[PDB]
Design a protein around this nucleic acid. Structure first.
Lengths: 97, 129, 91, 155, 81, 48, 150, 25
RNA sequence: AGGGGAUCGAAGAUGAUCAGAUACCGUCGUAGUCUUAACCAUAAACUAUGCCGACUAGGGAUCGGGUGGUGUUUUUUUAAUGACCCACUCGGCACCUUACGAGAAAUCAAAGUCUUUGGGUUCUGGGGGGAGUAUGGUCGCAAGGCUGAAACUUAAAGGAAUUG
RNA sequence: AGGAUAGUGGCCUACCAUGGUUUCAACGGGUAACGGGGAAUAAGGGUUCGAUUCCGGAGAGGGAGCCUGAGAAACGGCUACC
């Protein structure tokens, strides 16, 4: 049920795809949720978790690799991490999952 | 699938007539069907019939008087030259004094005798006797 | 254009050694020279160095595998069995 | 028509025997012969003010329209100034009192005064032999919609 | 029976038969006005609701979808319209 | 019904079907094969 | 019926003879339209919109309450989808089945159902291309099929 | 004779015919 | 081709029987039977009944879904919910009686609505053999599949019933 | 575009483009095939035949070439080969 929430965010809201822009939004305190692919390297996901704890940001662990996270965000390339900057009429933010 | 609502209507009327019922339901009952029944009703082979309006192409209830021996379509609707009507009537009708072959001409649905009177021809729909 | 009807990669062997041996070799060399998915970085960049050694062109990770395939059916079965035994031991 | 490199051949292209005298000048600065072919077919304005020569055009060339007037569907626009149309018809078999679908392919010359696409309905007029296979020229493109204008893509 | 009024069948005979096979086809479903104790708004619910319906004010479940008619919640009143 | 096409535009199918099925007839097959010309002691003649 | 089965079920809705709004219906047509557009903004398909309108509201038929059908209203309000609803769901089902087949290469029943779903996709796409709902030379290539449904 | 045995013995004969003709070719 | 290989068991080996008996019966026993990865593509693969559609007869069961009953039944005896009963309905596997009808009949609820001959459509047959043979093509590792004659020969072959 | 022709035309030549036909059966093969008007039989629908009294075409042992002439690639004309 996360694929449709993510797709409606992609349709209506604002997001960044990728480690560098995700970390940039985390320091600027613009992210409200980060989705991390399952095959993300553990050092990278630990550092994203640290950044999220410092910025008081929600973390969601996508049950899938970067290939189908990229598929889930309507993309033809691999995305390791997604950051939501402001969700539209989606309930992905208020939903715990 | 349904390919000829006229064929369905005339087969239903034949089956009701052979079983001896004095009424029959026709669905979906197009306007070619209404014209064919009007020809049969003009020549007396059926009684009154009433169209039932649903918003889904309609139905017809036909009262049968027991006078029908056989009504049927000719499929496909062959083109008939003015001189080939006699060939069709010879093949399809039991005698020369009664029975009709129904044509569809540019002047309308009609029986072969009216077609000869108006000197028109067209396509063959069916027959009644 | 299609250059061979059936010999494929074994067209390098010409007419010698027998068609059955060439077919067996064709199957295993196609398997041996295929590119494979990386289980770590998710790219289609895993190639065989030598028998049993499979290296990803990016992320430079090397995994021990089969002689002509990254994973053998026996190794997958063993992985599932070891996971099941581990789960009952830990629970 | 008006554009597309009229003088792109080794030989100079001009309509025969229409002379522009450099001794006296006018507004149009060039004489162009054209005529309407008759039979109620209008000469296109692209033919009227174009620059192509096309000695085989029924409106600006040396050929004339006479004989049969046919209609067909354009099935190929890959030759230079020539198309093939498809004429479908129903052939009667008397023994079975029935018909069978039949078709002929007719190669037709097309003037650069016209713009035709595969699928357009055209009417062609018979002329004298134009090539080994061509005997008909496009005289009007009867594509008010052409069954392609509202069916193709819209960017 | 060889003679019957196909145009005027009895109301019982028409109620006994399938919705598509009556003289003129029509639905056998209806709409309901449903009221919950913990509010005063009236919600209109389909008889074959197919979706768990809540009233506009509070998120109290009024119906549970089933294979046929939707079951109404135990503590709720309804009025057939 | 009846296993044959009755469409007003099915003349080609009806004609080709008859052409195919006439080959099961003895006389049609002999005539179209030229059997008397090829393998008959008399080359299609009454006497020899 | 049952284009790709031997089933012969006749189950369907029987919409009422009356083409006018029910006497007990009070909401305005513009209120129904704005509820429809809110549902569409939430990413709901026209059939889902009709279901929610029928159940939570009293909207018996959108075409009856308004003058237009749900997809017509959405296309007028600019919320028309890239591909039509039913083709979308057919492609999504084919993507699901082929994802399953990748993990299960010996599911020959799944392979059979895949062939049937593909042929249904091609038939419906042929119709949509004929009526120009889809651009010409639109194609289901089955390799980038998941691209069309995300 | 039983039909399936007609078929079997005919098949054996076709094997022998193929063998002798392959020998010739 | 790898794994497996308990059982049964082509081939084979043996004991009987028999005029013979590398048959039936008995004792073993290879391949096979099982599995993985590839082939093959055939069966009395049968309902020996193509598919889609419409109509035409009485009946009671049954499976799945739905509707109704102020029906029974279960912890508390309408007050926390299945099973059962009754009446309908859609869809399905079928069944019983009778054929008004059909058929050569056997029989058939379709194999009816067919000389009162036309709802749409696909495939197949044209006396028996030769013969699913020869040959060519094509698919297959092979076994073989698919496609497929002619010469020649012959007055019946065949179906369903009746009496013996 | 030119040449040739009585003249249009790949009819031929130079340059250029890659076109043209086809399961609505192209192309190939067979014909104990000249085509047609017609003939036989036939309730109707059809089936078979048509070398042959008329019309059109082709040939003059087989090929090719040509003079004369308005008109012939002629054969009761010529030239060459078989």
């Amino acid at each position: 049920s996360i694929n449709q929430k993510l797709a409606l965010v992609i349709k209506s809201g604002k997001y960044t795809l990728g480690y560098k822009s995700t970390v940039k939004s985390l320091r600027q305190g613009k992210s409200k949720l980060i989705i991390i692919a399952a095959n993300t390297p553990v050092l990278r996901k630990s550092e994203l978790e640290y950044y999220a704890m410092l910025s008081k940001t929600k973390v969601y662990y996508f049950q899938g690799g970067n290939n189908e996270l990229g598929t889930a965000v309507g993309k033809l390339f691999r995305v390791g991490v997604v950051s939501i900057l402001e969700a539209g009429d989606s309930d992905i933010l208020t939903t715990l999952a | 699938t349904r390919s000829s609502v006229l064929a369905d209507a005339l087969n239903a009327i034949n089956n009701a007539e052979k079983t001896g019922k004095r009424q029959v339901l026709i669905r979906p009952s197009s306007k070619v069907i209404i014209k064919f029944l009007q020809v049969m009703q003009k020549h007396g082979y059926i009684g009154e019939f009433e169209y039932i309006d649903d918003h889904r192409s309609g139905k017809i209830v036909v009262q049968l008087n027991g006078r029908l021996n056989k009504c049927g379509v000719i499929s496909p609707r062959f083109n008939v030259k003015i001189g080939d009507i006699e060939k069709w009537t010879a093949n399809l009708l039991p005698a020369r004094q009664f029975g009709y072959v129904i044509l569809t001409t540019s002047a309308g649905i009609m029986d072969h005798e009216e077609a000869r009177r108006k000197h028109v021809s067209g396509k063959i729909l069916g027959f009644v006797y | 254009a299609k250059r061979t009807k059936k010999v494929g990669i074994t067209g390098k062997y010409g007419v010698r050694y027998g068609s059955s041996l060439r077919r067996q070799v064709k199957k295993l060399e196609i398997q041996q020279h295929a590119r494979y998915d990386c289980s770590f970085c998710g790219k289609k960049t895993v190639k065989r160095g030598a028998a049993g050694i499979w290296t990803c062109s990016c992320c430079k990770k090397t995994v021990a595998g089969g002689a002509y395939t990254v994973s053998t059916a026996a190794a997958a079965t063993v992985r599932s069995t070891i996971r099941r035994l581990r789960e009952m031991v830990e629970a | 028509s008006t554009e597309l490199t009229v003088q792109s051949e080794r030989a100079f292209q001009k309509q025969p025997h229409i002379f522009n005298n450099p001794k006296v000048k006018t507004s149009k600065r060039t004489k162009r012969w054209y005529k309407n072919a008759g039979l109620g077919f209008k000469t296109p304005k692209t033919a009227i003010e174009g620059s192509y020569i096309d000695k085989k055009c029924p409106f600006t060339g040396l050929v004339s329209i006479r004989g049969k007037i046919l209609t067909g569907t354009v099935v190929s626009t890959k030759m230079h100034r020539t198309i093939v149309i498809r004429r479908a018809y129903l052939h009667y078999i008397p023994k079975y009192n029935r018909y069978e679908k039949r078709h002929k392919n007719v190669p037709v010359h097309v003037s650069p005064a016209f713009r035709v696409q595969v699928g357009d309905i055209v009417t062609v007029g018979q002329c004298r032999p134009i090539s080994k296979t061509v005997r008909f020229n496009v005289v009007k493109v009867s594509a008010a919609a052409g069954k392609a204008n509202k069916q193709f893509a819209k960017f | 029976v060889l003679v019957q009024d196909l145009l005027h069948p009895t109301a019982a005979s028409e109620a006994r038969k399938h919705k598509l096979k009556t003289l003129v086809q029509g639905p056998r479903s209806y709409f309901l006005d449903v009221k919950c104790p913990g509010c005063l708004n009236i919600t209109t619910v389909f008889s074959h609701a197919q979706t768990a319906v809540t009233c506009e004010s509070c998120s109290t479940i009024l119906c549970t979808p089933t294979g046929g008619k939707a079951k109404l919640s135990e503590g709720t009143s309804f009025r057939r319209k | 019904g009846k296993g044959k096409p009755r469409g007003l535009n099915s003349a080609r199918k009806l004609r080709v079907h008859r052409r195919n099925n006439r080959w099961a007839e003895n006389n049609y097959k002999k005539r179209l094969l030229g059997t008397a010309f090829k393998s008959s002691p008399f080359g299609g003649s009454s006497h020899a | 019926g049952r284009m790709h089965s031997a089933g012969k079920g006749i189950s369907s809705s029987a919409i009422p003879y009356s083409r006018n709004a029910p006497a007990w219906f009070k909401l305005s047509s513009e209120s129904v339209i704005e509820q429809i557009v809110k549902y569409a903004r939430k990413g709901l398909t026209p059939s889902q919109i009709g279901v929610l309108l029928r159940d939570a509201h009293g909207v018996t038929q959108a075409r009856v309450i308004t003058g237009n059908k749900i997809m017509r209203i959405l296309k007028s309000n600019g919320l028309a989808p890239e591909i039509p609803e039913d083709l979308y769901y057919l492609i999504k089902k084919a993507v699901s089945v082929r994802k399953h087949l990748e993990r299960n290469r010996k599911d020959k029943d799944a392979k059979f159902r895949l062939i049937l779903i593909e042929s249904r996709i091609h038939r419906l796409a042929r119709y949509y291309r004929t009526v120009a709902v889809l651009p010409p030379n639109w194609k289901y290539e089955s390799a980038t099929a998941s691209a069309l449904v995300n | 004779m039983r039909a399936k045995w007609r078929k079997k013995r005919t098949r054996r004969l076709k094997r022998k015919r193929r063998k002798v003709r392959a020998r010739s070719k």
